[PDB]
Design a protein around this ligand. Structure first.
Ligand SMILES: *[C@@H]1O[C@H](CO)[C@@H](O[C@@H]2O[C@H](CO)[C@@H](O[C@@H]3O[C@H](CO[C@H]4O[C@H](CO)[C@@H](O)[C@H](O)[C@@H]4O)[C@@H](O)[C@H](O[C@H]4O[C@H](CO)[C@@H](O)[C@H](O)[C@@H]4O)[C@@H]3O)[C@H](O)[C@H]2NC(C)=O)[C@H](O)[C@H]1NC(C)=O
Ligand SMILES: *[C@@H]1O[C@H](CO)[C@@H](O[C@@H]2O[C@H](CO)[C@@H](O[C@@H]3O[C@H](CO)[C@@H](O)[C@H](O)[C@@H]3O)[C@H](O)[C@H]2NC(C)=O)[C@H](O)[C@H]1NC(C)=O
Ligand SMILES: *[C@@H]1O[C@H](CO)[C@@H](O[C@@H]2O[C@H](CO)[C@@H](O[C@@H]3O[C@H](CO)[C@@H](O)[C@H](O)[C@@H]3O)[C@H](O)[C@H]2NC(C)=O)[C@H](O)[C@H]1NC(C)=O
Ligand SMILES: *[C@@H]1O[C@H](CO)[C@@H](O[C@@H]2O[C@H](CO)[C@@H](O[C@@H]3O[C@H](CO)[C@@H](O)[C@H](O)[C@@H]3O)[C@H](O)[C@H]2NC(C)=O)[C@H](O)[C@H]1NC(C)=O
Ligand SMILES: *[C@@H]1O[C@H](CO)[C@@H](O[C@@H]2O[C@H](CO)[C@@H](O)[C@H](O)[C@H]2NC(C)=O)[C@H](O)[C@H]1NC(C)=O
Ligand SMILES: *[C@@H]1O[C@H](CO)[C@@H](O)[C@H](O)[C@H]1NC(C)=O
Ligand SMILES: *[C@@H]1O[C@H](CO)[C@@H](O)[C@H](O)[C@H]1NC(C)=O
Ligand SMILES: *[C@@H]1O[C@H](CO)[C@@H](O)[C@H](O)[C@H]1NC(C)=O
Ligand SMILES: *[C@@H]1O[C@H](CO)[C@@H](O)[C@H](O)[C@H]1NC(C)=O
Lengths: 112, 118, 102, 453, 132, 129, 132, 118
């Protein structure tokens, strides 16, 4: 199955300063059409997670443009150029191009 | 505008047949979608159980679930049900019904902690 | 509005010949209507949709043109075909090309 | 390898444009009401709930709402259904009779004529030998002066008989879902910005359409599907003026309409088991029916449609509105059916504005005809039964049907007038999304395999 | 999308993809072709038109080599003038709509060739089972 | 056949009005629009207005508003539903209004629009003096 | 005639010729069997009678050895009392009408023999695939 | 009483796709008949090009025509069309549409000289 790894595993954010998560998938997520079936989630406790970025260039409906995403090969990148207090939770990098569907470990983010 | 709500137990004995059922409103079941079950052991990461489709796909699960998972769709009641036969106490997890679409799992269920205890 | 212009005006030709009447629009991308009117008679449709002919229209009439520039070609000029010829776009009319016997 | 053979693939996904019949579908909540107090949930299949709106991707189809089918079929189906809901009801042949009419008992000025005329007349009872003298109320628009004394007759009594509507069946619209039969599919153009004609880059197939409630309105089409974000105008040709302009705007404008004249119906026995429903007393004040609208929201939506209409006519263009230029009654006003009674309400208060390139409420008076001749047939008129109580209704104005005047001779201004016209322009405001295609299986294709003997 | 990896979803879902990808999903477009006081006449004529079209397609298949095999290799060759494109390109490059636009002219001769091939195979099999 | 019979020619005083009747026969009158056009000498054609007789919905030209009025009379009998009469009333007559007036109907084909008038009345001469 | 040499023309064209000549042209008589406010009831009952007859014939074939092979050798023998003529004479000497007049009596026992043969072949194939 | 009339060019360039079309009146196309094309070089004998049938026969041509001839019937317009791809100037000939029946080619077309010239 696909193995997902997020770096760093914890990053207490400084408000006014960016933060970043590098995702590492085990296999190539680029499908033959030219897209990339990769998604980002944000754990809230006891909740369905908040969804930041799917299909890295694409945007969810309900997400402000203060986030960003890029990546090459299997090293993809979620970035928050301006963190807020609403960025609480533990994130996720999850592939969608290979069965079985898998998810990640996550980055711990709290107030510094 | 889709809304998924789980229903079923959260406290069952081990070595039994577990079964939830997620109701779906806000949209139709027979869409370009995989109505899926995804779990999460407490304090740990997610664990994708499997899916079912509103078209005619055969349901495909995670092989780590040991062929004890049968997700059955109910198009006449806009629902889809998880099954888990022969549970253990290590299968205590938050359970989630969700919908894979052209975007990745947009509307989830709230997710309920099934604490398998004897 | 749309300003239409009948460019040959008076055309002096002999029977049996061919004729080409040009019309020019002020706005492109539209259809064109060609009308024949003999002297002291009821006018009569020739061309709608810039290339189609009406009932009783002989195929020697050929409408053509695109954009702002349209042609009406009349091959094998009969004596009866010496008439006034008008262009029509939705309500506005050209002032008329008069075909004259030479 | 170059010895290519052919293969037939059955069930190939490919379609063509076609024109077939369709499939009625009504929701089962309207089926819960017994004995069909609205028309035809028995002549229409129950809708399977939440059907398959399966998306389609990387697919470009050309839609054309103006040469579209199924709006003609919707018009034919609604006409045939309106006819099929009258054959049980009572014909009003014996009502064509000499009416002795006077004005209603009211302190009427000589300027403003009484809209309601009281009329007494002979009427046959159940028994053929005995006739009775009975009185009723009618409107000015239903009686004419046949010719001291002043005696009237009904307006329809020298062109056609009239059928009184049954008070069981109500004319309020239940939503109609249209569905394709087997071997056909309905493509819905799900594009946000789409002017009705051309390639739609984001379509989706479906088996059944959305809820299309059949409303009857001439100007200011009611309760329709509003647009997503913008205000979209649609025309078959904007430079042409003979075609109408369907304006669909985003925020629905709340309209309040009422007849405040309280009415008492009165059963008069025409014959054996023949009931006629006349108007009795006016309990209370004699007032005039009116329809409000909110002033600020209407001015805002007119600003929105001016901002959108300046796209097709240049920026520096004066846009003004006018009222209807004339004709029959039910194309000058805007007409509808509130609570099972018909309103014909004046629209001069909504369309007196001009627009330069840089808590109140509008009231507008209506008139109420009791007889109607809608679709303008040759020999049918529907009489409508007067209903009890002060009658009010709230609706969401969704779109307009406008018409440019035939402007020539170098004018900056381009005026717009609301014109009802055909009823099909209502249904073309709700069938622009859908088209019907025929699936054709068994494509054929070359590949490298030969059938062994 | 959702059906990525395990390439399937509902009917007409493969209509946007290439014909090579769409060839693996043909059972449902075959499936959604049959099942689905004066309006009963409309319902009935719709139902009998559906079963008449389905029976015409099954009879067109049944006179060819395949009764219900749904993918049929056969014995007629292919004129390369008709396709005149690279063979493996069309299964990764073309939709079925575009391919049906391509061979719109080259139709109704293929079907007579199929009938001739099937009748020739039938008389050859009759001779083969006759001399044995 | 499609027949559009107009009324006879007329000589009217200036400032008065005139009414021209166009009787149409041979088609279902409640379907196709009726247009009115004029022919002034040395001015070419000039369109006036159209009327749809199904509800009599009219539209007049911009430079002629307030001076013209178009009505119609349908056929209300189930035996002759084809014939109908349009009426154009032109008020406020000037010496420039001396012209020939026409009622016209469009074609009946698919790609036929609304303004390519196939069928024409015989014309009516109106002289103001 | 016109179709001499290449022996074919439209449907029922071979009906005058011998059954050996008519055997090569069977696809079109099979083809012209399905396709073709109160009168709609007559049209509809004609259409459903046509498809009911066609489905009865296809079901009579399908319970025999051949689904849609259109020429079927089978495993039942032939009683020579029925034909009682020279075998190769009838394919150059008899029309199908005259042959159907000949075996009018000897009918409906053949069909039960076909059903017994097909069910026997099915149980033999079930045993053969069972012991393997 | 059958009447066949050809239509099409009589002057074409060589190395091009030639096509005529013969209209048929007086009878029906789908008869016991082969609607045929037969040509004749000038001053020389006839040359049978091929036929098509109103039934369901596959069209069979003269093999000397080198598989460049496709006769296509149009039953919805009572016509049938000759084709000839890659013509030469030696293919100049009077062309004839005709009808083989129980008698041999009773009603012809008038026959028009196609003079292939560059
Ligand atoms: C849709 O809604 C619009 C908006 O109201 C209606 O438009 C109005 O229509 C009326 C008549 O149809 C217009 O006419 C007005 O009538 C008033 C009453 O008439 C009496 O008084 C006059 C003398 O003025 C007598 O000749 C007559 O016999 C009556 O005794 C007049 O008072 C009005 O005059 C106005 O203008 C003059 C100009 O000098 C002023 O001096 C006056 O004080 C007064 O302001 C006028 O003649 C009325 O104008 C229309 N309203 C507007 C705002 O223009 C439509 O009629 C309605 N649609 C339908 C089908 O009814
Ligand atoms: C309802 O039916 C009654 C019964 O026929 C009608 O009454 C009758 O109407 C006629 C016509 O006006 C009357 O004839 C005239 O009567 C006047 C007054 O008597 C007389 O001066 C004339 O010379 C002429 O005879 C008739 O008398 C009258 N009968 C009665 C009993 O009233 C009535 O008109 C019908 N309509 C209504 C609205 O009542
Ligand atoms: C559209 O709006 C215009 C006004 O902007 C309306 O014009 C008005 O029309 C009415 C009647 O149609 C005229 O009323 C007149 O009243 C006298 C009083 O008795 C009567 O004798 C006349 O015959 C006429 O009815 C009124 O003068 C006129 N307004 C002006 C300024 O001339 C028009 O009617 C409106 N159209 C619709 C369909 O509402
Ligand atoms: C056209 O649109 C406006 C609605 O905004 C209305 O125009 C109004 O017309 C009346 C005519 O009597 C004006 O009343 C009088 O106007 C004079 C000036 O001419 C003024 O000095 C008087 O005090 C009196 O107000 C009224 O002012 C005018 N409204 C405005 C805002 O100027 C009219 O209702 C619309 N036309 C129709 C036919 O509905
Ligand atoms: C139309 O009538 C409705 C009647 O419900 C009005 O709605 C109410 O308006 C009052 C006054 O603002 C509010 O206090 C209520 O809360 C409203 N109720 C509802 C259910 O909306 C509406 O304002 C009227 N609109 C116009 C333009 O007159
Ligand atoms: C979408 O369709 C176009 C046109 O057929 C094609 O060129 C393109 O490769 C297709 N893309 C996908 C992802 O199928
Ligand atoms: C609409 O509102 C604007 C902004 O107040 C105002 O300028 C304009 O005059 C209003 N329109 C009308 C017709 O009152
Ligand atoms: C199909 O035939 C027509 C002539 O009827 C021709 O114009 C067209 O180009 C042909 N199609 C292709 C793809 O060549
Ligand atoms: C068929 O049977 C009948 C008796 O029912 C008999 O008369 C007839 O001769 C038989 N046919 C032949 C060809 O022998």
């Amino acid at each position: 199955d696909v193995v997902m790894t997020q770096s760093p595993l914890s990053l207490s954010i400084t408000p006014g300063q960016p933060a970043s998560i590098s995702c590492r998938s085990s296999q190539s997520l680029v499908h033959s059409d030219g897209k990339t079936y990769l998604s980002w989630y944000q754990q809230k406790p006891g909740q369905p997670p908040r969804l930041l970025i799917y299909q890295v260039s694409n945007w969810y409906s309900g997400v402000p443009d203060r986030f960003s995403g890029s990546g090459t090969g299997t090293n993809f990148t979620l970035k928050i150029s301006r963190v807020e207090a609403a960025d609480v939770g533990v994130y996720y990098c999850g592939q969608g191009v290979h069965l079985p569907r898998t998810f990640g470990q996550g980055t711990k983010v709290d107030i510094k | 505008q889709v809304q998924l709500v789980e229903s079923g137990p959260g406290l069952v004995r081990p070595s039994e047949t577990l079964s939830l059922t997620c109701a779906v409103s806000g949209a139709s079941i027979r869409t370009k979608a995989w109505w899926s079950w995804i779990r999460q052991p407490p304090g740990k990461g997610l664990e994708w159980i499997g899916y079912v489709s509103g078209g005619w796909d055969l349901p495909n699960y995670n092989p780590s679930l040991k062929n004890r998972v049968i997700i059955l769709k109910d198009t006449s009641l806009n629902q889809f049900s998880l099954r888990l036969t022969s549970v253990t106490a290590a299968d205590t997890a938050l359970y989630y019904c969700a919908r894979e679409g052209p975007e990745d799992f947009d509307v989830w269920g709230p997710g309920f902690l099934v604490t398998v205890s004897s | 509005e749309i300003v239409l212009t009948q460019s040959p005006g008076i055309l002096s030709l002999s029977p049996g010949e061919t004729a080409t009447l040009f019309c020019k629009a002020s706005q492109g991308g539209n259809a064109m209507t060609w009308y024949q009117k003999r002297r002291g008679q009821v006018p009569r449709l020739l061309i709608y949709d810039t290339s189609r002919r009406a009932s009783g229209v002989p195929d020697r009439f050929v409408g053509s043109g695109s954009g702002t520039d349209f042609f009406l070609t009349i091959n094998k000029l009969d004596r009866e075909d010496f008439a006034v010829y008008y262009c029509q776009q939705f309500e506005f009319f050209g002032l008329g090309s008069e075909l004259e016997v030479h | 390898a170059e010895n290519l053979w052919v293969t037939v693939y059955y069930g190939v996904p490919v379609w063509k444009d076609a024109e077939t019949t369709l499939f009625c579908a009504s929701d089962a909540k309207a089926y819960e009401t017994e004995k069909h107090n609205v028309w035809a949930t028995h002549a229409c299949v129950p809708t399977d709930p939440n059907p398959q709106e399966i998306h389609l991707e990387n697919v470009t189809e050309e839609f054309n709402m103006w040469k579209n089918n199924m709006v003609e079929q919707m018009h034919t189906d609604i006409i045939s259904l309106w006819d099929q809901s009258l054959k049980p009801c009572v014909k009003l042949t014996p009502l064509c009779v000499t009416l002795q009419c006077t004005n209603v008992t009211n302190n009427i000025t000589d300027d403003m004529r009484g809209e309601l005329k009281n009329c007494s007349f002979n009427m046959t009872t159940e028994l053929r030998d005995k006739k009775q003298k009975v009185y009723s109320l009618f409107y000015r628009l239903d009686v004419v002066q046949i010719n001291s004394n002043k005696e009237y007759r009904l307006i329809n009594c020298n062109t056609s008989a009239c059928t009184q509507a049954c008070p069981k069946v109500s004319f309020e619209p239940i939503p109609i879902h249209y569905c394709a039969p087997a071997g056909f599919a309905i493509l819905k153009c799900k594009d946000k910005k789409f002017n009705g004609t051309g390639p739609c880059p984001s379509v989706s197939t479906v088996q059944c359409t959305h809820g299309i409630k059949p409303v009857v309105s001439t100007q200011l089409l009611l309760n329709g599907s509003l647009a997503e974000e913008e205000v979209m105008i649609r025309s078959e040709n904007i430079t042409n003026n003979a075609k109408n302009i369907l304006v669909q705007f985003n925020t629905p404008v709340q309209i309040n309409c009422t007849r405040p004249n309280n009415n008492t119906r009165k059963s008069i026995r025409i014959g054996p088991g023949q009931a006629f429903y006349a108007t009795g007393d006016i309990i209370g004040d004699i007032r005039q029916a009116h329809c409000n609208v909110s002033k600020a929201t209407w001015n805002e939506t007119l600003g929105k449609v001016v901002k959108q209409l300046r796209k097709h006519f240049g920026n520096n263009t004066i846009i003004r509105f006018a009222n209807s230029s004339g004709g029959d009654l039910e194309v000058t006003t805007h007409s509808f059916n509130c609570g099972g009674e018909f309103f014909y309400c004046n629209t001069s208060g909504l369309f007196n504005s001009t627009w330069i390139s840089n808590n109140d409420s509008i009231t507008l008076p209506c008139r109420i005809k009791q007889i109607i001749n809608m679709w303008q047939r040759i020999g049918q008129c529907m009489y409508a039964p007067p209903i009890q109580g002060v009658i009010r209704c709230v609706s969401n104005i969704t779109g307009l049907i406008l018409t440019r005047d035939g402007g020539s001779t170098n004018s900056t201004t381009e005026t717009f007038r609301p014109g009802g016209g055909d009823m099909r322009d209502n249904w073309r405001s709700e069938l622009y999304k859908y088209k019907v295609v025929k699936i054709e299986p068994l494509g054929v294709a070359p590949t490298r395999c030969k059938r062994r003997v | 999308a959702v059906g990525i990896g395990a390439v399937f979803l509902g009917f007409l879902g493969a209509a946007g993809s290439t014909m090579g990808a769409a060839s693996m999903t043909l059972t449902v477009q075959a499936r959604n072709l049959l099942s689905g006081t004066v309006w009963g006449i409309k319902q009935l004529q719709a139902r009998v038109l559906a079963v008449e079209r389905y029976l015409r397609d099954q009879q067109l298949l049944g006179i060819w080599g395949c009764s219900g095999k749904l993918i049929c290799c056969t014995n007629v060759p292919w004129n390369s003038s008709w396709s005149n494109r690279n063979l493996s390109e069309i299964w990764d490059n073309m939709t079925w709509l575009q391919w049906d636009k391509e061979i719109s002219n080259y139709t109704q001769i293929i079907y007579g060739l199929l009938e001739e091939s099937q009748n020739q195979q039938e008389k050859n099999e009759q001779d083969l089972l006759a001399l044995d | 056949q499609v027949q559009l019979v107009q009324s006879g020619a007329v000589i009217k005083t200036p400032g008065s009005s005139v009414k021209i009747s166009c009787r149409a026969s041979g088609y279902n009158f409640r379907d196709y629009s009726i247009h009115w056009v004029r022919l002034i000498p040395d001015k070419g054609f000039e369109w006036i207005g159209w009327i749809k007789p199904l509800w009599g919905a009219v539209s007049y030209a911009r430079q002629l508003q307030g001076r013209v009025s178009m009505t119609r009379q349908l056929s209300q009998d189930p035996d002759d539903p084809d014939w109908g009469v349009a009426y154009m009333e032109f008020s406020g007559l000037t010496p420039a209004d001396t012209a020939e007036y026409f009622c016209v109907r469009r074609g009946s084909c698919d790609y036929c629009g609304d303004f390519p008038w196939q069928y024409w009345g015989q014309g009516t001469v109106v002289v103001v003096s």
